[PDB]
C-alpha cells in the first residue's frame, strides 16, 4: 500500500539514512571481462561468466567439485563431453552480438512484415501467372519434403543445448536451432497460403512425408540427417557436421540453386519471399559457426593441430555423406521442363561448381582440407539422367 518514494515519512527516513557520498568509484558492470572489440559491450557484460565452472574446466573461476552428480559419478559438466581441447572455453564471441532482446526484435519485425505481405499478395491476385505443372507437382511435393530435412537439423541441437561447456556457445546453438524450426514452419505456411488461394491444392503433409520416407530422390538425405541427429553425442562434432559441412553443401544447393533459381524461370513470385528469409538465417548462423570453429578451436595457441586432425577426419566422413546425398538428389532434373542453361547438364555442372567452390573458400582453406572440385562435380553428375 505504502511506497518508499511517495510516502513523506518513509522518504524522509530513507533520505536521512542514505550517505551523502559514494563508497566506491568503479561503476562498470563486470569490468574484469576481457573485451574482444575496442570496448566492453552490453552483450559481453550480460553474457560472459554466467556459467559457474570450477578451475579444472578451462577458464573457470570457481573451485571445488560439483555438489551433486549423476548416479555412478558423472559430473554436471565435464571435459569428457568432447574430443576438442582449448585453453579457455569463454573465448567465443557472436559477430552479430545477439542476446535475447535484439533477437526477438528482429524476428518480430519479420513476422509482422510477412503477414502484411501475404495480405497484399492475396488482394493483388498474382497467383494467376504461375506455371501449373511446377506448382502442382514440384513445389507441392518436393518443397514440402524439404520440411523434414529442416526439422531433423533442428532436433540435432537437443544435446548441444545441455552438454555445452560455455554460455555464449549455448546462445549461438539455441538461436541456430530456432532458425531451423522457423524455416520448417515457414515452408508449411507457404503451402497453407497456396491452399487457400488455388482450389484443389492440398496442403496436407501426407504426400510430402511419403516422399521424404520412401522416394529414392531423398534417400541419400534422410540417412545423413539421421546420423547427425541420433548417431553422435559430441556437441562440437554435431555443430560441425550439421552446419559447416552437410548444410553448407546439400542444403545450400537444394535451397538456393534448385528451388529459388527455377522459381525465377517458371514465373513464381511467392517462393523467393520465403527463400530470402532462409538464406538470411543461414548467413547469420554461418558467421557464428565460422567464428567458433576457426578463430577459437582450429587456431588455438597451445592446441590446434589436435583440433585440426579431428576436424579433418570429420570433414572427410561427412563430405562423403553429403556428396552421396547430392548425387542422389540430382535425379530430380528428369521431372522438370527443359530450360537451356538451367536444366541441361551444363547448367547443373556450373551450379555444382559454384556450390563446391564457395564451400572450399569458406571452410576448407581455413581448416586445411584439400578438395578437388572437378572430381566432386563428376561424382555428383554420375547420377545425372
Amino acid at each position: 500500500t505504502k511506497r518508499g518514494l511517495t510516502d513523506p515519512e518513509r522518504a524522509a527516513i530513507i533520505a536521512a539514512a542514505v550517505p551523502d557520498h559514494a563508497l566506491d568509484t568503479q561503476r562498470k558492470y563486470h569490468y574484469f571481462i576481457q573485451p574482444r572489440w575496442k570496448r566492453l559491450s552490453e552483450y559481453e557484460q550480460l553474457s560472459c561468466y554466467a556459467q559457474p565452472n570450477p578451475d579444472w574446466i578451462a577458464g573457470g573461476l570457481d573451485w571445488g567439485d560439483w555438489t551433486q552428480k549423476f548416479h555412478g559419478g558423472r559430473p554436471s559438466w565435464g571435459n569428457e563431453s568432447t574430443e576438442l581441447r582449448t585453453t579457455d572455453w569463454y573465448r567465443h564471441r557472436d559477430p552479430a552480438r545477439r542476446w535475447h532482446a535484439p533477437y526477438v526484435k528482429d524476428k518480430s519485425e519479420e513476422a509482422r512484415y510477412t503477414q502484411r505481405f501475404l495480405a497484399a499478395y492475396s488482394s493483388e491476385g498474382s497467383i494467376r501467372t504461375i506455371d501449373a505443372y511446377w506448382r502442382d507437382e514440384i513445389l507441392n511435393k518436393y518443397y514440402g519434403a524439404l520440411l523434414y530435412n529442416e526439422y531433423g537439423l533442428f532436433n540435432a541441437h537437443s544435446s548441444v543445448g545441455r552438454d555445452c561447456l560455455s554460455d555464449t556457445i549455448r546462445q549461438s546453438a539455441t538461436f541456430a536451432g530456432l532458425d531451423k524450426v522457423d524455416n520448417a514452419q515457414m515452408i508449411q505456411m507457404e503451402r497453407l497460403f497456396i491452399a487457400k488461394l488455388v482450389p484443389g491444392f492440398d496442403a496436407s503433409t501426407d504426400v510430402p512425408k511419403k516422399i521424404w520416407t520412401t522416394d529414392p530422390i531423398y534417400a541419400g538425405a534422410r540417412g545423413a540427417v539421421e546420423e547427425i541427429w541420433q548417431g553422435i553425442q559430441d556437441w562440437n562434432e554435431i555443430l560441425w557436421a550439421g552446419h559447416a559441412v552437410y548444410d553448407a553443401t546439400f542444403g545450400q544447393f537444394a535451397r538456393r540453386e534448385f528451388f529459388q533459381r527455377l522459381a525465377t524461370v517458371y514465373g513464381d513470385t511467392l517462393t523467393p519471399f520465403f527463400t530470402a528469409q532462409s538464406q538470411t538465417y543461414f548467413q547469420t548462423t554461418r558467421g557464428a559457426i565460422e567464428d567458433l570453429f576457426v578463430y577459437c578451436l582450429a587456431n588455438d595457441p597451445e592446441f590446434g593441430a589436435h583440433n585440426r586432425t579431428f576436424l579433418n577426419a570429420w570433414t572427410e566422413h561427412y563430405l562423403a555423406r553429403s556428396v552421396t546425398a547430392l548425387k542422389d538428389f540430382v535425379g530430380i532434373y528428369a521431372k522438370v521442363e527443359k530450360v537451356a542453361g538451367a536444366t541441361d547438364r551444363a547448367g547443373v555442372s556450373e551450379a555444382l561448381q559454384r556450390v563446391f567452390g564457395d564451400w572450399k573458400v569458406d571452410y576448407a582453406d581455413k581448416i586445411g582440407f584439400n578438395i578437388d572440385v572437378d572430381q566432386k562435380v563428376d561424382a555428383v553428375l554420375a547420377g545425372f539422367k
Partner: protein, 510 residues
C-alpha cells in the same frame, strides 16, 4: 481467382506440427532415465517461433522504456534504503544462476521428449530462461550505475565464491536441475522449484522492494512473472506423459519427496533471513508467508490436482513445518558470525527491530537478542576493537559445521530447530550430516556427494589472505566489500582483519 485479403495465423500452422516427426530405429533419448514419455502428448499453448518473438518483443519494449527513461529522470536509483540495497546484491545474483541452469534443464527435457508439441513447449521454455537470465543480470547492471555503493553489484560473479551461503545455492538451483534422471530434474525444476517456491517469491520480493523504496525490481520482476504459467503447464504435461508408464507407480513419489526436501532445506532459512534481516520496513512475518505458500497453496491445491495421477503429498512435510519456525534465525546468526566472507554490508537489529522480533517471535529476545547485544558491546562494528564473532563462538564452546549433502551451516548448541549432528568415518575420511533425509541420501549414493566445504579448503590459512586471493577488496585495494555496518564512515580494511589473527581450524579434528 479469389481476390480477398487473407493471411495465415499461428493456430493453422500449429495444427500440423505433430506430423513433422518420422519413425526410424534409433530415434531414442541420449540420456539415462527410468521412464518413457507418451508419444501422443499435446501442448496447451499454440506457440510458434514468430508469435513467440512478437510477444517477447512487445513485453521487452514496455519493460525497457520505463527503466531507461522515467525512473532515471526521477532519480529513483538512490532513493532505496541501504539494507535492501545490499540485500538485492545477493538476491539478484542468486536468482540469475538458477535461471541460467534452467536453460540446460529444459534442453535435457526437450532431448527426452518424443512428441513434437512437447518439444515445441520445451524450446519455448529454453528461450524464456535465457530471457530471465539476461533480466536478472540487467538489474545488477542498473544498480552498478545508479546506486551509492556499487562494490557488491560490480563483480558478484567473481566474488560470490568466497562465502558459505553460495554452496547451498549451487546444490538447489545449479546441480539439482541438471544432474540425474530427466524426470527427476523436471520435478526439481517445475513441480517444486517454480510451482512451490520461485513464483510466489518473485511476487513477494516486489512488495518488499516497493515497501523499502525500490522500483527497479518490481519493474523487472512483474514482467518476468508473466512467463511462468507456460512452465507450470510444461510440468503438468510432463507428469501426465509418464502416468501410464509402470515405473511411475514405482519411483515418482520417491523423486518428489527427495526434490521437496532438497529445495526446502535451503529455501526455508535463506529467504526468511534475507527478508526479515535485510529490510527496514517489514511487510509480514516470514513464518506466515511460508505457511500460506508451501503448506496451503502448493501443498494443498497443486497436490490435490495431481493426486488423480498417483501423486502423493511428501512424507517429509511434517519436518519442514516443524523446522520452518526458527531456521532462518539460526541461519542469520551463522551469516552474521561469518560476515568477512560475504560480499555485502550487514546491520545488526536495532531497538525497533528487536521489538518487532520479540512481538512476532516470543522468545527471540532471551536467545538471540542477548547474543547480538553482547556482540555489539564487545565491538562488533568497531574496526579498532578487533572483534571476530567466529573466535567468540569458538571460545564459548559453540562450533560450526557444514552438512555434507545440503552444504548448510549448523550450530548445534545455539539452534532451536530440528536436526542433530552425526559424525561418520568412511574409507578414511570424516563426514558430518545434520538430518535423517540427508543421511539416507548420503548412505544410499555416496558417489554423488563429494563436495568440499570451506573448512577443508581454508584449513590453516589466515583470513586476510583468503579475502585478498578471492578479490574481496574494493577499488582502492584495501577496504573490504563486506562490512558489519551500513554507515558510510569507519570502514574495515585488510589490516584490521590481519590484526585479529583468525586462522581456520578443523571442526571434525575431535
Amino acid at each position: 481467382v479469389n481476390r480477398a485479403p487473407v493471411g495465415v495465423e499461428p493456430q493453422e500452422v500449429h495444427k500440423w506440427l505433430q506430423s513433422f516427426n518420422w519413425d526410424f530405429k534409433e530415434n531414442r533419448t541420449k540420456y539415462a532415465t527410468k521412464y518413457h514419455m507418451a508419444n501422443q502428448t499435446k501442448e496447451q499453448f499454440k506457440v510458434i517461433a514468430k508469435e513467440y518473438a512478437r510477444m517477447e518483443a512487445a513485453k521487452d519494449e514496455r519493460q525497457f522504456g520505463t527503466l531507461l527513461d522515467g525512473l532515471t529522470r526521477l532519480g529513483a536509483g538512490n532513493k532505496v534504503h541501504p539494507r535492501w540495497g545490499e540485500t538485492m546484491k545477493v538476491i539478484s545474483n542468486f536468482l540469475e544462476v538458477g535461471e541460467y541452469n534452467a536453460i540446460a534443464a529444459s534442453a535435457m527435457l526437450w532431448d527426452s521428449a518424443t512428441a513434437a508439441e512437447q518439444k515445441n513447449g520445451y524450446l519455448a521454455q529454453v528461450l524464456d530462461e535465457i530471457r530471465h537470465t539476461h533480466q536478472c543480470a540487467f538489474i545488477n547492471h542498473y544498480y552498478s550505475k545508479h546506486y551509492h555503493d556499487p562494490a557488491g553489484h560490480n563483480d558478484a560473479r567473481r566474488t560470490r565464491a568466497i562465502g558459505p551461503l553460495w554452496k547451498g545455492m549451487k546444490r538447489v538451483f545449479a546441480d539439482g536441475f541438471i544432474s540425474g534422471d530427466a524426470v527427476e530434474c523436471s520435478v526439481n525444476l517445475q513441480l517444486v522449484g517454480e510451482a512451490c517456491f520461485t513464483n510466489p517469491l518473485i511476487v513477494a520480493v516486489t512488495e518488499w522492494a516497493s515497501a523499502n523504496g525500490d522500483e527497479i525490481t518490481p519493474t523487472v520482476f512483474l514482467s518476468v512473472e508473466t512467463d511462468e504459467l507456460r512452465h507450470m503447464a510444461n510440468g503438468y504435461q510432463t507428469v501426465v506423459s509418464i502416468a501410464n508408464d509402470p515405473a511411475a507407480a514405482k519411483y515418482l513419489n520417491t523423486d518428489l519427496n527427495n526434490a521437496f526436501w532438497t529445495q526446502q532445506k535451503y529455501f526455508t532459512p535463506a529467504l526468511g533471513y534475507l527478508f526479515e534481516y535485510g529490510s527496514k520496513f517489514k511487510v509480514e512475518p516470514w513464518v506466515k508467508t511460508w505457511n500460506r505458500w508451501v503448506y496451503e497453496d502448493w501443498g494443498g491445491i497443486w497436490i490435490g490436482r495431481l493426486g488423480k495421477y498417483g501423486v502423493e503429498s511428501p512424507r517429509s512435510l511434517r519436518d519442514a513445518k516443524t523446522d520452518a519456525y526458527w531456521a532462518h534465525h539460526d541461519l542469520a546468526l551463522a551469516a552474521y558470525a561469518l560476515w568477512p566472507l560475504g560480499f555485502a554490508r550487514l546491520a545488526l537489529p536495532d531497538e525497533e527491530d528487536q521489538e518487532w522480533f520479540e512481538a512476532n517471535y516470543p522468545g527471540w529476545a532471551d536467545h538471540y537478542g542477548k547474543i547480538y547485544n553482547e556482540w555489539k558491546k564487545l565491538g562488533y562494528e568497531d574496526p579498532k576493537s578487533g572483534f571476530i564473532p567466529y573466535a567468540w563462538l569458538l571460545a564459548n564452546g559453540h562450533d560450526v559445521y557444514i552438512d555434507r549433502v545440503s552444504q548448510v551451516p549448523f550450530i548445534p548448541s545455539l539452534a532451536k530447530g530440528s536436526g542433530s549432528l552425526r559424525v561418520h568415518e568412511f574409507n578414511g575420511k570424516k563426514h558430518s550430516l545434520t538430518d535423517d533425509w540427508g543421511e539416507r541420501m548420503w548412505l544410499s549414493e555416496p558417489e554423488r556427494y563429494e563436495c568440499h566445504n570451506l573448512f577443508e579448503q581454508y584449513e590453516g590459512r589466515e583470513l586476510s589472505e583468503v579475502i585478498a586471493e578471492g578479490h574481496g577488496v574494493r577499488s582502492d585495494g584495501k577496504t573490504l566489500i563486506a562490512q558489519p555496518h551500513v554507515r558510510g564512515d569507519n570502514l574495515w580494511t585488510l589490516e584490521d582483519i590481519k590484526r585479529a589473527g583468525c586462522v581456520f581450524p578443523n571442526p571434525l579434528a575431535k
